[PDB]
Amino acid sequence: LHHAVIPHGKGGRSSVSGIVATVFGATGFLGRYLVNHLGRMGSQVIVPYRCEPYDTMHLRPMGDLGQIIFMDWNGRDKDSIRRAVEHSNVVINLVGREWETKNFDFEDVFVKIPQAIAQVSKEAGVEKFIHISHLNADIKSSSKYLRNKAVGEKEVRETFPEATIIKPADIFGREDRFLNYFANIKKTVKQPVYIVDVTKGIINAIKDPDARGKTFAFVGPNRYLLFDLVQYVFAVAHTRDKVERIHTTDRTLPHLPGLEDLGVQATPLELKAIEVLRRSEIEDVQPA
């Protein structure tokens, strides 16, 4: 291929690695951590932000000079998106919102966004189209949000089928959402996995081609009850569709490639629980 893309030396701090990554979203949780892992690897990140430039400006210095580029976009027009994916090596899409707006439903962001960006991805002729989703997002009932994400899964498999639809379980981290709902204040099977396992899997799958066409699902290493999780989060620590999703179910699907096909070690609960549970009574039930 053309030069200035081939890797050179180590990684990080304006190192020349192999990849050029265009990330959609990235202002929130997982996209920001993935920008930090790309700066750790030392690649070039193309981030279009639609929000105020203060947010991208205080997450600016995470890389070195030349390692990032900022641009502007709307979620309605193909021209700005094609201008974003003019010279792009790989592209990832991260999208998701807790409540709908006056201009966006759960549908047509999970529908109209991956149709358009997958369209210009397949038109631009790129590789490693990686689109995220959620565990057990059925076509069927119990969640408008999960059925809209399943429609997004179906459409990402529809247009450019050589892609990676990647679903984790309800992941936790330093800026977790549902555990923040748990802290600041029925039967449920659940196994949460920590964020760094997921994003290490993402960077492994995006530096390892032959991954085009395969879909991923991630597993928490414990498989215990939500009520014991509440017991623990208050033991130490001393919307409606969101609470229905976390009270629905979270099961395993061993028929698509997950963790050890990628060859990565999972991280336990208690370490990162003692990390984020700032501001020793460990239950550790783990039923099967």
Partner: protein
């Protein structure tokens, strides 16, 4: 129509109130501290632009990183950078701060405050002119003018 109009004029009013005073704290290690205290000189005013230097980080909205930031120093720099309100703005002043610069080599010296905090205004010079520093401060206020925070919050 009237909603966008009210949001526009209200955002103009509150951003004007932001860029009005902006009283900072002075970090100031090496001779760029003397240059900061000489934009605190009587000739080049600060009162005219609502600026009064005060080292209390509980109210310091803008913060000027000046002096040679060292690898022995910088975690305390981010420690002071933490407890600071929701708009926080950084002026990298000086060749020592704008990339490390003259001491871009020489171990236990950071290659500029970009490796620690974001920088919202870069002003080069060794020493930068205090007049040029004040020019960069007015450009910082015009960046405050160009935010449309409430407009983004409405059109979300």
């Amino acid at each position: 129509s009237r909603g966008e109009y009210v949001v526009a004029k209200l955002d103009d009013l509150i951003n004007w109130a932001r860029r009005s005073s902006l009283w900072p704290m002075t970090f100031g290690l090496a001779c760029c501290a003397v240059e900061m205290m000489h934009m605190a000189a009587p000739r080049y005013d600060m009162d005219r632009f609502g600026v009064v230097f005060r080292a209390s980080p509980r109210q310091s909205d803008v913060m000027i990183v000046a002096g040679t930031l060292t690898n022995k120093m910088a975690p305390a720099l981010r420690k002071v950078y933490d407890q600071m309100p929701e708009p926080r703005y950084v002026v990298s002043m000086g060749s020592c701060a704008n990339g490390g610069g003259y001491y871009h080599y020489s171990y236990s010296v950071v290659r500029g405050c970009d490796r620690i905090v974001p920088v919202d205004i870069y002003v080069p010079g060794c020493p930068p002119t205090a007049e040029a520093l004040l020019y960069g401060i007015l450009q910082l206020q015009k960046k405050i003018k160009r935010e449309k925070r409430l407009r983004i919050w409405y059109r979300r």
